[PDB]
Every structure is written in C-alpha cells, then in structure tokens.
Symmetry: D2
C-alpha cells in the first residue's frame, strides 16, 4: 500500500539524501548503485531497520552500450519485483569529468557522460512508462548548464539533453498521468577530489549565504515535485542554486 | 507567528494564497483595491479561526506620484498589525489587451504599474523595513515567451517582473531575503471570458485538459516560502500543466 | 527612392554607428537626440555632405510622461515629413544608472522604464500605425539574466524590451513588419568609467578579452534590416564575444 | 588564398543551399554526404564548372559507433588535403524520426539520432580545432526545441545537446579565435513525402507570411555568421523561424 520509488546513484551524497527523505515520506525505495556496493547495502540496512522490507539495492552500470536498455528495464523491474509497483523514478546518477576539445577513448567518454546523464534517463523513462495515482519522474539537471565549466563539453551536452528529455517526456507522458520535472542544483556537495581552496572559491560565489547547498536542500525540492502539492506541475525545472546562476562573470 | 502581505488577496488566486498561508500559521494582510466587501469577508473567516491574525489594507497599485507612499503603507500595515513582515506575495495584476494598431498612458500606469512597478516599490519597502525565513514571491506568467496576441503591455509588465525577480534575488541575498516566482498558465479563467473560449484553453493543457485550481498555485507559493526552499532564490516555478511545452 | 530609418539616441556612440552604417547602406536617416544637440547636428551635416538631403535631426525626451505618446508620434512623423516614408525604426536610446533597493523614485521609473521600454512601445505603435522591407530593431542587453547588482529598474526595462520584441513580432507579422533585437554584452564602455574598471570588464570577454566596437554592434543591426533576414522576426542576436556564457 | 568550408549533409535541401551560398561567397567546399552520392557528385560538378577545383565530396555515415571519431577526423582531413586549410565547419546533417516512449532497435535509434545531431558535431568540432583568419563553426539547431513534437524525444535530446555543444565549444575555442554559433530554423523545407494538406497545416501557423523558410533563407543566416560582419558573435543561436516559436498552443 506504500508507494515505491527508484533512485539512481543513491548510495552516497545527493542520491542518498533523496532516498532517505523519500523513505521518511512513506516510500519504499530501490537504491541503485554502480560501484558503491558497501554504501548501498549499508543504507538499505539502515532503512529496513526503520521499517522492514522497505528498501532493496540494484546494481547497474548506466554507461551507454547495446545492453543499456536491458539494464534500465532491470532497474525498473527490480522495483516491481520487490514492491509490486513503481510510483516515482529519480534520475540522479551522473558521470562528470573534463573532455577538452583540444589536445579512456573518446567513444568511452561519450558512452559514460552521455549515457549516464541522458540516455540512461531516457531508457529508464521508457521502462517506467511501459510498466505502468501520483506517478512522477524527477531528473537531476544542472543550474549552470548555460554558463558551463570550460572543457566539460560532453557533460554539458548530456545535461542539456536531459532538459530536452524532461520537456519531451512531460508532454508525451501527461495523458498517462505521469509528471516529469527537474531539479537543477548549482553548487551542492563539492567533488571529494577537489582541494579546499577550490571548494572555498566556489562557495564564495554563491549569493545566498556564500555556501554550497546541503544534499538535504536538494532532496527537499525533489520531495515537493513528487508530492500532492505539485500535481499540476510538469515539464518544470526548479533551480536550487542560492542565486549562483544569476551572477555575471 | 510570522506575517505575510498578499496583494490582490480578496479574490481568486490571491485569496487562495492568503488562505493557505493562514492555514500554515501566518498572520496575513489582505490587500485590496476595489474589493472591500470580499476582503473583509475573508478577514472575518480567518479571524474566526484564530483571533486577530488577519487585517485588510486598501491601496490602488496604479503607478502615479503617490504609488511609493501607498506601497510603503501596505508594508507598514503589516509591521503595525503584527510587529514583523516575513513574506511578501506580489499577486495583484491588471490584464487586458493593448493593440499596437482609457488613454494609452493610463494603460501604461495600470499594466506596468500593477504588474511591475508596484512589486518593485513593495520590494524596496519590504527590504528597507528589515531564525527568520524572509522571502518574496512574485506571480509571473508561464506564457511570457509565447504571448497572447495584442497583449504587449501586459507581456512587457510580466517580463519586467521576471527581471525584478532576478535582480532582487541577487541584491537581497546578502540580507537573507529570497525572491522567487510562481508562473501559472491557465488557472482560474477570467470571469468575463465566455464558456466555449475557456474550454478551448482547457483542451490544450497536457496534464488533464483542465485549468489549475487557485489552490494548486497557492501550493507552489507555500513551498517557496517554506523551510524546504531555504536555498532557492531567483527561481520561477511554472505551474501550468505542461501548457508552455505545447507547440502551435 | 532610398528607404528611410529612425535611430533613437543616434548622436554618439552605438546609435551614431548604426545611423552611419545605415546611411552607408543607402538609407536616409532621422538622428534622434535628447541633450546631444551639437553632436547630432554635426553628424547630420557629415552625412548630408556625403549625400545631400539624406539626414535630419529630431529632438525628444523619451522619459515616460503623459506627453510621451505625442513625442513618439512626432519622431515617426519627422521621418515621413523629411523623406516620405519610414522603413526602419532602431530603438537605441537608453538611460542607465543604479536604483538600489535598500531624483525621486518615480522620476527614476519614468526615465529608466520610459527610455528602455515604454518609448520603444509607443514608437512601435506609431511606426506601425503610419504604414517593402519594414523592420524594427531594439537594442537589448545580453546580460539581462545575469544583471549588475543595484540596477533593478534598468534590468526591468530591458526585460520589458525583450517582451515588446516578442509581442510586437507576433502582432506585426501579418503587416510584414519584422521586429528583432540586438543584445550587446560589453561594447563601448561608459565615458565616466576609469581605465582600471574598463579593463576589469575587458578581461572577462572570452573572444579577444576586449569590448565590441560600435561598428560590430551596427553590423548586426544592418543584417537584421537587410534582405538576408527576411524570414527573421522575434529573434534577439547576442553580440557579446561569449561574455554571457562565463560563469561567476 | 580562398578559404575552405566543410558542410555536412550537403547533397540536398538546406545543406545544399548552404554549400552553394558559401561557394558563391568565395569558399572552396567539401560536400559531405551519406546516402545521396548522385546528388552530391552532381553538386560538386556544378560548382567545379563555375570554378575549377573548388568542390570535392566526402562520404561518411555519422551514426555513432567505434569508428565515428576516425570518420570525423577523415572529413576534416579531406578539406585540408583538397584545399590546404579549413576555415568553416557547418554541422547540418541530421536524422529525424519518432521514438515513442510508449508502445530499428532503440540503441540503433540512439546512435543515429544522438550521433548525427550531437556526437558527430562534437567530434567534427574536436577535429576542426585540433587541426588549426576568420575561423568559425555553425551548428544547425531547431527553433522549436522547447516546444517539441510529440514522440520525438531522442531527436529533441540530440538538438538540445547541440545547443550545449554550441555554448561549451564557443567558450573553450574563443581563445583560439574560433567562433561557434547556431542557426535554428522553424519550418523550412517540408519532408518530401508530406501531403500538401499537411504542409499547409504547418505553413498556416507561421506569423510571418504563413509560409516555410526557403533553404536559401536559412543559408543567408549561416553566411552572416561566417562573415566579417559577425566577428564578435560567438555562442549565439539565431532563430530563423518567421515568429513560429512565439505562437502559443
Ligand atoms: N553536487 C553538485 O554540486 C551538483 C551540481 C550540479 C548538478 N548536480 C547533479 O545532481 C546529481 C547528484 O550529484 P552528486 O554530486 O551527488 O553526484 P555524484 O556523487 O558525482 O554521482 C552520483 C552517483 O552516480 C553514479 N554513477 C556515476 N557513474 C555511473 C555509471 N557509469 N553507472 C551508474 N551510476 C554511475 C555513482 O554511483 P556509485 O558510487 O554507486 O558508482 C555516483 O555515486 C547528479 O546528476 C549531478 O550531475 C550536482
Ligand atoms: N488566473 C490565471 O490563470 C493566471 C495566469 C497567468 C498569470 N496569473 C497571474 O497570477 C496572479 C493572480 O491571478 P488572478 O486571475 O487571481 O488575478 P486577477 O483576478 O485578475 O486580479 C487579482 C487582483 O489584482 C487586483 N488589482 C487589479 N488592478 C489593480 C490596481 N490597479 N490596484 C490594485 N489592485 C489591483 C484586484 O483586486 P481588487 O479586486 O481588490 O480590486 C484583483 O482582484 C496575477 O499576477 C496574474 O497575472 C494568473
Ligand atoms: N555600450 C554597451 O556596452 C552596451 C551594453 C549593453 C546594452 N547596450 C545597449 O545598446 C544601446 C546603445 O548603448 P550606448 O552605450 O551607445 O548608449 P548610451 O551612450 O548610454 O545612450 C545612448 C543615448 O540614449 C539617449 N538618452 C538617454 N536618456 C534619454 C532620454 N531621457 N530621452 C531620450 N534619449 C535619451 C542619450 O542621448 P543624448 O546624448 O542625445 O541625450 C544617449 O546618447 C542602449 O540601448 C544600451 O542599453 C549597450
Ligand atoms: N527543414 C526544416 O524545416 C528544419 C526544421 C528545423 C531544424 N532543421 C535542421 O536543419 C538542418 C538541415 O535540415 P534539412 O531538412 O535540409 O535536413 P534533411 O534533409 O532531413 O537531412 C540532411 C541530410 O542529413 C544527412 N544525414 C541523415 N542521416 C545521416 C547519417 N546517419 N549520417 C550522415 N548524414 C546523415 C542526409 O544525407 P544523405 O541524403 O546524403 O543520406 C540528409 O540529406 C538539419 O540539422 C535539421 O535538423 C531543419
Ligand atoms: C560533484 C559532481 C562532480 N558530480 C556530478 N555528477 N555532476 C556535477 N555537476 N558535479 C559537480 C561538478 C563541479 C562542481 Cl564545482 C560541483 Cl559543486 C559539482
Ligand atoms: C486571470 C487573468 C485575466 N488575470 C490576470 N491578472 N492575469 C492573467 N494572465 N489572467 C489571465 C488571462 C488570460 C487567461 Cl486565458 C487566463 Cl487563464 C488568465
Ligand atoms: C554604456 C551603458 C552605460 N549605456 C547604456 N545605456 N546601457 C548600458 N548597458 N551601458 C553599459 C553599462 C555597464 C557596462 Cl559595464 C557597459 Cl560595458 C555598458
Ligand atoms: C526535414 C526534417 C525531417 N529533417 C531534419 N533533419 N530535422 C527536422 N527538423 N526536419 C523537420 C521535421 C518536421 C518538420 Cl514539420 C519540419 Cl519543417 C522539418
């Protein structure tokens, strides 16, 4: 009787915070992960301790390939196998690294950056829709998509395609009662790899508070979009960026 | 308890907004221009729920030499009644055609004054008077880039209000004041509009083929003023059932 | 006969460059000015010496007031009086100064919203009413969505001018009048800016770390009025050397 | 001393008009094609009759695959081999067909729609920049990207990704003096098969003239962007759509 959600890349960081807050709201969750098996299992353990049989894990690589459609079908199928329904998909998983235009193969970079950020969402969307009373999809977009980081072409291309998907799917799935929306963080949890001085450089650019968003702040916007308070919203992308996208060079 | 000002609050969307903030625990100032009876009826409904948590304030928001003083008075009414003003919702709006091919300058004063200049002056007054969670929410329009034909001045006004939203979000962020917008598509249709005409619009909406309840607009407002939106500023949330996505 | 154009604010800087390039393309021009009488007359003399009877001046304050509609009518009528026709309108004149949220404010509203938005609207109404390759070009701002802090009213004006561009393109398309915009980023820097502050801006521009020349801005105007843009309406061409793509 | 340009999908329609107008402007051209060899050769022969040794053809499938990077390198290399320089790249080739979310494999659809519309442009852009004065790239985008055709999600995703490329590449290449811009048609040349009654349905929606753009009208915008008159323009997309994108439902 409790609705169920799939969250991709949910073992750590923003996707973990989304899975936790959906579970706190009443959802049963599928915690998708690729490499972070220990974190995924530990989160499912923590959730199930709170309410038994309310969390499962599902491992998959969301790089594009000729098997990606089956992997995405398997993710959605894992939700139906565990819970008998699938009410919400959150497309959160994402690869991010530089792809300079001027001096892994480039075809691997294309498969990873465009696959994870764009093609996997599209196939997860297809599978979600095909397998189908408050259904909705939330794509994690990027508030800085029109002011991109230099040398991040392929990532930027994938995030723009994800906006395209959010709009196209919102239009096509509306007659089935499925809403499709986005949440677009600016700087939220910074990369684990990034040094302290660079982290502080980013934090100082943010108008509202000179700090990054917490993962929970991003999750809060996802919660709103899946809620009954958003039943007329589809095709919308909510920036959660403390004003960063409004700041000129 | 926090306190909110809602302009144009006597009817329709603004009334739904004031009702929902009140339900969330806000004390409210119900601003009205011509709708005194309706404003007082709403304040009566609210104060019967919790005594002395709603007051009314009359003002014309047409631009003129006295609009700054009227806008300062609206904000002051909140501080006098409640001792604080945490939320401003700029909801009041005039809407009618202004074909390119009332004098045109009265049309300017009404369309650009209610939809843009009054919000600007209320924003300045709200900011100047300042655990708190301060925010402004501007009622925008989801169809701003696919405008209704012969509605130039209305559309100009709504574009100006997007500019205010962004400029104010940036300038007031250091003060902890967030500024955001909600952009309805087809919501409560204009009383005048004929029945067949309304139904024409409803059929174009992807989500359900009907207009948004005022309550659906209010729900987005309530989110943006909430602690669940504390990192959000300069954002405009469309609440249009997908209508802006639909090509000609 | 040669076609004729009106350029507002055409005495100096970008508006002069536009008028010169339209003249070089074969147009007869009305050089609108407000305060810059010596500059306007000097430019008109230069153009008339190149080709007799092809430039006149027209003085007008474009601040909003109850007489602005008549002033806008008069500018358009000056072109028909001098040249028998008016093919192109370029809305270039603009006021720009800070209006912090924390002259009277109503004067600031009349000047910044008047010159940047209402006078373009009324000139557009007058141009259309008085009516082949007819078009209007509005000088917009590439940084509208990433505004300078404390410039709310200027940003509101330039957003309203985007609305006008789109609403007018839609409404005037059946009359064969095209309406487009050109959006500079950093072009001619303000005369009063010191070199150190000018270099701060230059260093932000990806394409050559320099501001646009006035001629570069005029080239885009010339394209949009030309027969090579005969299907373009409602479009705003950024001419900003990539500045709008640069994150904080 | 004449500059040279590559135009992809140049044998017919818009790409053909672009190649013709570039040639008229004084450019030597590489006419890329995939299936339309007779038309490509016929255009090259016409152009060479106008001025000898000013046009060559280059065949390539721009579907994404292991070999697509080498193909795109070869297209750029063809221009340097023929003409000793490559000044202008126009990414015009595009696949277009529906990909409904609800009921070719779907991964073939991904490789064709996302490869032609986005990945090939990226790889061509990489190859163009690596091999390097008025250097510029022009991407043929779509004015209706934010009000998409129902059941065209992958096409829409590909065209949004191309906007991202246009912006990301403008920023990254601006230090090399390479400008990157787009031209976004609305309704231009209608599909060959389409009945007049359906073509008329589209034409009647366009505010400016109730007609589609000619190919030559699209080409005139490309010619402006590559010209000395656009030397400060980069990262810009010029809609050429007769007001169609301003029309509400
Ligand atoms: N953090 C920010 O400031 C920020 C800013 C803008 C946008 N966003 C967007 O918000 C979302 C959450 O951001 P985040 O920083 O939490 O993300 P993240 O830590 O960089 O990545 C989220 C997860 O994506 C999964 N992932 C990566 N490559 C994968 C592949 N080939 N197959 C399957 N899964 C893969 C990883 O799972 P495993 O660990 O299980 O391998 C990873 O933990 C992302 O879509 C991001 O682009 C975030
Ligand atoms: N309804 C929709 O479908 C829709 C669609 C798009 C955008 N919106 C936006 O959403 C907001 C609410 O829409 P709505 O349909 O509820 O609005 P509405 O009924 O047209 O008007 C709201 C109130 O604004 C006040 N107002 C009008 N002119 C005024 C003036 N000169 N001075 C002071 N107040 C004045 C009136 O209050 P009094 O009655 O007291 O005179 C009016 O009741 C507006 O900003 C509108 O532009 C609504
Ligand atoms: N320069 C840039 O970098 C840049 C950047 C973004 C946008 N723009 C836009 O491009 C356009 C040209 O810019 P610019 O720097 O050449 O402009 P500008 O020098 O600041 O102003 C152009 C003219 O506007 C006229 N003007 C000012 N107030 C007026 C009033 N109350 N009534 C009538 N005319 C008035 C003045 O004419 P008189 O001298 O005759 O009084 C002035 O010469 C403007 O629309 C501007 O906003 C420019
Ligand atoms: N026509 C319009 O109304 C319109 C509207 C919006 C946007 N646009 C954009 O404008 C551009 C030109 O439009 P158009 O109507 O002239 O295009 P089109 O005729 O549909 O296609 C252009 C050419 O693309 C090449 N192409 C298709 N699949 C390919 C593949 N797998 N590998 C290599 N090349 C391939 C084909 O070349 P071969 O014939 O040699 O196989 C075809 O002749 C396109 O980017 C299009 O998306 C056009
Ligand atoms: C965290 C990281 C890498 N994860 C993904 N998948 N996508 C991003 N956009 N990320 C990012 C990248 C750069 C910055 Cl400065 C910040 Cl705050 C975050
Ligand atoms: C409600 C009305 C008139 N009131 C204002 N102030 N602003 C609008 N945009 N309005 C509107 C106008 C047209 C339509 Cl079709 C619909 Cl649903 C609503
Ligand atoms: C030149 C100036 C003032 N003139 C007007 N009317 N409008 C602008 N936008 N202008 C501007 C303002 C700031 C900068 Cl940094 C730069 Cl380069 C230019
Ligand atoms: C010509 C076609 C198919 N070719 C490509 N590559 N891309 C498009 N956008 N095309 C299109 C599609 C639909 C319409 Cl209505 C019109 Cl005018 C044109």
């Amino acid at each position: 009787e409790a609705p169920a959600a799939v969250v991709t890349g949910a073992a750590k960081r923003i996707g973990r915070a989304i899975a936790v807050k959906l579970h706190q709201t009443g959802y049963r969750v599928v915690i998708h992960y690729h490499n972070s098996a220990e974190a995924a299992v530990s989160l499912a353990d923590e959730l199930n301790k709170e309410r038994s049989n309310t969390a499962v894990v599902c491992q998959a690589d969301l790089t594009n390939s000729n098997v990606l459609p089956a992997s995405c079908e398997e993710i959605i199928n894992s939700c139906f196998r565990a819970f008998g329904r699938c009410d919400v998909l959150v497309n959160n998983a994402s690869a991010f690294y530089p792809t300079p235009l001027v001096q892994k193969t480039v075809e691997t970079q294309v498969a990873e950056l465009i696959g994870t950020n764009a093609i996997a969402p599209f196939l997860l969307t297809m599978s979600f829709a095909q397998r189908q009373s408050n259904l909705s999809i939330v794509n994690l977009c990027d508030a800085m998509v029109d002011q991109p980081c230099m040398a991040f072409s392929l990532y930027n291309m994938g995030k723009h395609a994800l906006v395209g998907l959010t709009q196209s799917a919102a239009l096509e799935l509306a007659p089935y009662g499925i809403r499709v929306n986005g949440v677009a963080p600016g700087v939220s949890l910074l990369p684990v790899a990034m040094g302290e001085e660079e982290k502080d450089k980013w934090r100082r650019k943010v108008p509202l508070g000179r700090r990054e968003a917490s993962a929970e702040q991003i999750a809060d916007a996802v919660i709103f979009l899946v809620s009954g308070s958003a039943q007329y919203i589809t095709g919308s992308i909510i920036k959660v960026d403390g004003g960063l996208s409004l700041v000129h060079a």
